[PDB]
Design a protein around this ligand. Structure first.
Ligand SMILES: [Mg+2]
Ligand SMILES: [Mg+2]
Ligand SMILES: [Mg+2]
Ligand SMILES: [Mg+2]
Ligand SMILES: [Mg+2]
Ligand SMILES: [Mg+2]
Ligand SMILES: [Mg+2]
Ligand SMILES: [Mg+2]
Ligand SMILES: [Mg+2]
Ligand SMILES: [Mg+2]
Ligand SMILES: [Mg+2]
Ligand SMILES: [Mg+2]
Ligand SMILES: [Mg+2]
Ligand SMILES: [Mg+2]
Ligand SMILES: [Mg+2]
Ligand SMILES: [Mg+2]
Ligand SMILES: [Mg+2]
Ligand SMILES: [Mg+2]
Ligand SMILES: [Mg+2]
Ligand SMILES: [Mg+2]
Ligand SMILES: [Mg+2]
Ligand SMILES: [Mg+2]
Ligand SMILES: [Mg+2]
Ligand SMILES: [Mg+2]
Ligand SMILES: [Mg+2]
Ligand SMILES: [Mg+2]
Ligand SMILES: [Mg+2]
Ligand SMILES: [Mg+2]
Ligand SMILES: [Mg+2]
Ligand SMILES: [Mg+2]
Ligand SMILES: [Mg+2]
Ligand SMILES: [Mg+2]
Ligand SMILES: [Mg+2]
Ligand SMILES: [Mg+2]
Ligand SMILES: [Mg+2]
Ligand SMILES: [Mg+2]
Ligand SMILES: [Mg+2]
Ligand SMILES: [Mg+2]
Ligand SMILES: [Mg+2]
Ligand SMILES: [Mg+2]
Ligand SMILES: [Mg+2]
Ligand SMILES: [Mg+2]
Ligand SMILES: [Mg+2]
Ligand SMILES: [Mg+2]
Ligand SMILES: [Mg+2]
Ligand SMILES: [Mg+2]
Ligand SMILES: [Mg+2]
Ligand SMILES: [Mg+2]
Ligand SMILES: [Mg+2]
Ligand SMILES: [Mg+2]
Ligand SMILES: [Mg+2]
Ligand SMILES: [Mg+2]
Ligand SMILES: [Mg+2]
Ligand SMILES: [Mg+2]
Ligand SMILES: [Mg+2]
Ligand SMILES: [Mg+2]
Ligand SMILES: [Mg+2]
Ligand SMILES: [Mg+2]
Ligand SMILES: [Mg+2]
Ligand SMILES: [Mg+2]
Ligand SMILES: [Mg+2]
Ligand SMILES: [Mg+2]
Ligand SMILES: [Mg+2]
Lengths: 99, 122, 138, 208, 151
RNA sequence: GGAGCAAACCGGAUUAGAUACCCGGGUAGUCCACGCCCUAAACGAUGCGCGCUAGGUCUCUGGGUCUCCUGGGGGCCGAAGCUA
RNA sequence: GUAAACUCCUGAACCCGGGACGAAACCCCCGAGGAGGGGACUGACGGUACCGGGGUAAUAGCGCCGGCCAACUCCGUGCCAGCAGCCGCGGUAAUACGGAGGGCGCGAGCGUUACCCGGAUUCACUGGGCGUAAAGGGCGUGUAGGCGGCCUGGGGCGUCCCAUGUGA
RNA sequence: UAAUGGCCCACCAAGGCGACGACGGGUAGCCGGUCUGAGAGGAUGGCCGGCCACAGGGGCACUGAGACACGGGCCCCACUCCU
């Protein structure tokens, strides 16, 4: 199978490409408590139909950049700006631990 | 800690320091003597103990004990040390193996003999 | 602010039995009522009751003990000495059916919510099911 | 010698004779009959209470000298029954009482078991077909323990087998007499063979 | 019919104007090796007196023990103040795998197969007390089906 | 800003000595405005939220049917339990 | 210490004799350069493994012995000589030093050093703590995160079961 | 190029990444398995089998189905001998 993953748009500042937040979760290898992990995927968008905050999902495919290996398979949810707001915020934090 | 705290900061393994660093992972290192002298034990013992400063193959320069009923050793004696601390000699963490190299094993021992480079007599 | 209701229930009883009480109540839950029912129809306590405190639902749980002792402490034997959450809101605990644990070598038991319902180990062994490990008791 | 030395003494330490020596150790003449007390410049002296190490060990050494075998050989077999799916105590005996140099013994072919080893390592015995000469052969049930040719008429054969006519051997090794043989029957039970050793103790010592 | 077993025994002092003034203690167990036991701590100015002072002590104070075949039914563990001891029942042909002190209990109870482990303060005195209270709390399939067999 | 007090300082004494304790002086400082510093035995040597598990009395503050019940604070004994 | 001596018995070694398996197929011939069939060659190890006979009483060490830790006396020595893994032993009556007698344990090995886990529930998920033993942030506000009451109902990512591929 | 690709050019846009630890430093061939431990864990990759990378250090291409090739070629450093 080609892997199919699911995430939220966070970048349409790229021509014909979109970044998406593929969260994932599993139980801890020693401590049982399940954990959630995240990994931004660069996903090709043939006609930048997809806008920000869209909950869509990707598709394993042939390389079309240095980093694009996936495309949008199909949109599902839409206008989910709360989520972009919660990850944009995560970065906003960063410029504060610096020295 | 709570499991989450645990998840985050995690437990932490601790390493043992190798109490015989001059070995450099070996079982023994060769070397020469620079000085053979006697030296008093700390509290609460008293006796002139025989030691040796040994300049090593490993570029080192360490202190070592000479066990036995007297010894021959003088400076420039090719020699060999193995791990082993003396309790009441602060600092000494190595013993010269009697018998190998220019440090040959003690005369006229018969009991516990193999630990002192003496052959079996007949 | 009340994290977990189940463990508080499981402990509400505990405090109440070690001081040797008649009954006790607990914020009624459809799910909770099943745990109780296992403990109830295990013979582990007398029973619970569809009770209602001040227009808010509760379950009057009726406790079990044993005969007067003889020693300087006539204080009765216990029916349910031990009880604790296995899984916690902190770290949840899911198990396979291959990995269900024997309790007190069968003396006591363990409950677990399964995809079919709340069961005990051998119940859940027999339906051959995994689940969330709610408690060990004896 | 690796174990070949002064022997009807060992028991003086053990405090219970291994009935060791062969014919002599049945006679009012065994070291333990005449002078029963630990050897050496003491032993005539009393006894401080034996600690659990002393305890657990001294039953081990007994059992070890009952077959006169080396620790490296001994250690193996013990660990083996602990691995083997079953009751270690009984089974461990179930290997000892299965060594050929021991089967030769309990079939009465030889006097003291120490003697028996020699006969073994001289092809004087042949299990089933060809001759064996391994002391440590783990004999199997249903096997045929025989006696060779430059042997079948030899002295101690004659002499020692003479006594086995009349003698009732263990309930697990049917001895034919003067036909020079016997079949190892079943793997012998715990009860089946009595030794002056509570072997459960030997389990503890090792498993330390 | 009975049977003794003389555990650790100690000299302790009590400084009075004259000099470091001594006395002795003595830990001990009596056993029948088929289901009953008892532990007794005795204290008198002399070794064997305090020894067989713990004589009467070990015999009066007592308790049963439900060794099934040659082992306890359910494992338990016990913190006594802060000195913990665990004990899991064992399959036949296993033996007293246990500390010095726990062994003294279980041989005189009659236990053979048993796996144990001392945690916390391994001070032998309390461990003994711990191991007793442990053997007090053991139950059997009948013991439960009397308090789930509701009258 | 500066009355009292008071490190530093000065003198007196006490002592073997007294750069100290006790005494006669005395400046920063102690007070105000504004701005820094950010430590402490910053202690209940006891992180914050919630639910449960006997009572006895001594108070602080509410509401009542201000009897002596119903809330919220502060103290002391003390069941159970915990505690080396 | 039955230890020896000695009596009797065996017969490692050692000489002799004989002597492999491992190798049936490439090839040739019947046939159809095919099935099937039949015939032939080839052993480095190696005169080895081994089987048969003659046959001699044939090396034993190293560690330890105050406690943990099994095993004790005599002497020499006098905080010297030295031992020691911790605790410690030795300053004229030392089971701890060195010799010995004996004892203990393993045995063609016994010690020693070095290294890894172990014991170390002493980084604790299993499995610890923080009033006085090392440990509560001086106190608040709140970002991210972590966690979160009761009752329907939908999906079924977690979780679960079955079959299956896979896990050489 | 056998083939997807900032693999490489061109020209355009201005983005990509980071406390779920980017970037920098130190260390290391990885695995089947091995050692240990009651286990959970801890430690470990020599024999042997699977993959990787190199052949005194560094580049580079030609031949070829396959190499950028220990016992092939070219060039630069080091080393060794022939003259
Ligand atoms: Mg890439
Ligand atoms: Mg000195
Ligand atoms: Mg000299
Ligand atoms: Mg000289
Ligand atoms: Mg000698
Ligand atoms: Mg919850
Ligand atoms: Mg249901
Ligand atoms: Mg002999
Ligand atoms: Mg012996
Ligand atoms: Mg089994
Ligand atoms: Mg018979
Ligand atoms: Mg073991
Ligand atoms: Mg073990
Ligand atoms: Mg009686
Ligand atoms: Mg002690
Ligand atoms: Mg402790
Ligand atoms: Mg009963
Ligand atoms: Mg003034
Ligand atoms: Mg003034
Ligand atoms: Mg002002
Ligand atoms: Mg003002
Ligand atoms: Mg200002
Ligand atoms: Mg503090
Ligand atoms: Mg808050
Ligand atoms: Mg109050
Ligand atoms: Mg108080
Ligand atoms: Mg002969
Ligand atoms: Mg020859
Ligand atoms: Mg042909
Ligand atoms: Mg042909
Ligand atoms: Mg040849
Ligand atoms: Mg002869
Ligand atoms: Mg002879
Ligand atoms: Mg002889
Ligand atoms: Mg002779
Ligand atoms: Mg020592
Ligand atoms: Mg003298
Ligand atoms: Mg003295
Ligand atoms: Mg002494
Ligand atoms: Mg000797
Ligand atoms: Mg060995
Ligand atoms: Mg562990
Ligand atoms: Mg603790
Ligand atoms: Mg204090
Ligand atoms: Mg949040
Ligand atoms: Mg469905
Ligand atoms: Mg299949
Ligand atoms: Mg599978
Ligand atoms: Mg497999
Ligand atoms: Mg190519
Ligand atoms: Mg392209
Ligand atoms: Mg342009
Ligand atoms: Mg990194
Ligand atoms: Mg490595
Ligand atoms: Mg393993
Ligand atoms: Mg193990
Ligand atoms: Mg590795
Ligand atoms: Mg690969
Ligand atoms: Mg290279
Ligand atoms: Mg290649
Ligand atoms: Mg290439
Ligand atoms: Mg190429
Ligand atoms: Mg050049």
């Amino acid at each position: 199978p080609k892997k199919v993953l699911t995430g939220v748009v966070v970048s349409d500042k790229m021509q014909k490409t979109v970044t998406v937040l593929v969260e994932r979760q599993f139980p801890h290898p020693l401590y049982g408590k399940v954990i959630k992990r995240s990994k931004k995927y660069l996903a090709h968008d043939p006609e930048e139909k997809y806008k920000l905050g869209d909950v869509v999902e990707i598709i394993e495919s042939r390389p079309i950049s240095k980093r694009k290996r996936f495309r949008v398979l199909r949109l599902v949810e839409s206008g989910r700006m709360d989520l972009v707001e919660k990850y944009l915020i995560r970065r906003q934090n960063y410029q504060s631990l610096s020295k | 800690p709570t499991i989450n705290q645990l998840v985050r900061k995690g437990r932490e393994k601790v390493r043992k320091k190798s109490k015989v660093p001059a070995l450099k992972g070996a079982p023994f290192r060769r070397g020469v003597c620079t000085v053979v002298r006697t030296v008093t034990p700390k509290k609460p013992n008293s006796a002139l103990r025989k030691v040796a400063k040994v300049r090593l193959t490993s570029g080192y320069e360490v202190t070592a004990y000479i066990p036995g009923e007297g010894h021959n050793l003088q400076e420039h004696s090719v020699v060999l040390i193995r791990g082993g601390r003396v309790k009441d000699l602060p600092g000494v963490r190595y013993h010269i193996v009697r018998g190998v190299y220019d440090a040959a094993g003690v005369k006229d021992r018969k009991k516990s003999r193999s630990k002192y480079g003496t052959k079996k007599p007949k | 602010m009340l994290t977990d209701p189940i463990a508080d229930m499981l402990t509400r009883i505990r405090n109440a039995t070690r001081v040797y009480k008649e009954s006790t109540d607990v914020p009624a839950s459809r799910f909770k009522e099943e745990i109780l029912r296992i403990l109830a129809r295990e013979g582990f306590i007398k029973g619970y009751e569809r009770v209602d405190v001040d227009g808010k639902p509760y379950l009057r749980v009726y406790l079990k003990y044993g005969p007067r002792r003889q020693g300087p402490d006539p204080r009765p034997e216990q029916v349910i000495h031990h009880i604790r959450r296995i899984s916690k809101p902190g770290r949840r605990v899911y198990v396979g059916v291959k990995e269900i644990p024997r309790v007190r070598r069968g003396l006591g038991i363990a409950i677990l919510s399964t995809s079919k319902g709340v069961l005990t180990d051998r119940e859940a062994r027999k339906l051959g099911v995994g689940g969330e490990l709610i408690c060990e008791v004896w | 010698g690796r174990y070949i030395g002064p022997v009807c003494r060992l028991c003086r330490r053990e405090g219970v004779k291994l009935y060791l020596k062969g014919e002599r150790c049945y006679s009012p003449k065994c070291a333990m009959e005449r002078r029963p007390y630990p050897p050496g410049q003491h032993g005539q002296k009393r006894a401080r209470r034996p600690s659990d190490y002393a305890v657990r060990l001294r039953e081990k050494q007994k059992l070890r000298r009952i077959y006169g075998i080396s620790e490296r050989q001994f250690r193996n077999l013990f660990e083996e029954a602990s691995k083997k799916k079953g009751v270690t105590g009984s089974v461990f005996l179930g290997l000892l009482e299965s060594r050929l140099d021991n089967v030769v013994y309990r079939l009465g072919f030889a006097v003291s078991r120490r003697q028996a080893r020699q006969l073994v390592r001289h092809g004087h015995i042949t299990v089933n077909g060809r001759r064996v000469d391994l002391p440590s052969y783990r004999v199997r049930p249903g096997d045929e323990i025989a006696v060779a040719e430059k042997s079948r008429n030899l002295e101690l054969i004659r002499q020692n087998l003479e006594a086995m006519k009349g003698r009732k051997v263990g309930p697990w090794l049917s001895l034919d007499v003067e036909g020079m043989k016997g079949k190892f029957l079943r793997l012998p039970d715990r009860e089946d063979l009595a030794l002056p050793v509570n072997e459960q103790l030997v389990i503890e010592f090792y498993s330390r | 019919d009975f049977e003794e077993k003389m555990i650790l025994i100690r000299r302790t002092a009590r400084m009075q104007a004259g000099g470091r003034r001594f006395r002795f203690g003595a830990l001990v167990v009596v056993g029948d090796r088929q289901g009953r036991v008892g532990l007794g701590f005795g204290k008198a100015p002399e070794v064997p007196l305090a020894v067989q002072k713990a004589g009467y002590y070990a015999r009066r104070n007592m308790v049963e023990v439900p060794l099934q075949n040659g082992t306890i039914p359910h494992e338990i563990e016990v913190e006594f103040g802060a000195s913990k001891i665990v004990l899991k029942p064992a399959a036949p042909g296993t033996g007293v795998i246990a500390g010095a002190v726990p062994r003294a209990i279980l041989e005189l109870a009659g236990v053979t197969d048993i796996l144990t482990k001392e945690l916390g303060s391994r001070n032998p005195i309390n461990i003994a007390y711990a191991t007793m209270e442990a053997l007090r709390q053991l139950r059997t399939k009948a013991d439960v089906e009397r308090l789930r067999k509701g009258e």
